[PDB]
Amino acid sequence: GIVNVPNPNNTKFQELARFAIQDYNKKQNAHLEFVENLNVKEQVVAGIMYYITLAATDDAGKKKIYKAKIWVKEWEDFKKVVEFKLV
């Protein structure tokens, strides 16, 4: 039941992404730049598990592509980064 979400770049998805990156920053002690979502998949877990291939940056335009799993319960504003890693 992994459904591709059709507008992977929309505002919500990107708020997710920005959350994941915020949490990484404050986790592994380092600020990366948000650039934007490459893909966004959906699965009904206890709420909804979102698996995002997203893109960020080092120095000026020194890019890199990460992946994040985030567990959301939007009917609670609850969101939790379950994993994040650069490819």
Swiss-Prot record:
<comment type="function">
    <text>Probably has a role in the plant's defense system.</text>
</comment>
<feature type="short sequence motif" description="Secondary area of contact">
    <location>
        <begin position="43"/>
        <end position="47"/>
    </location>
</feature>
<feature type="domain" description="Cystatin 2">
    <location>
        <begin position="1"/>
        <end position="87"/>
    </location>
</feature>
<protein>
    <recommendedName>
        <fullName>Multicystatin</fullName>
    </recommendedName>
</protein>
<comment type="similarity">
    <text>Belongs to the cystatin family. Phytocystatin subfamily.</text>
</comment>
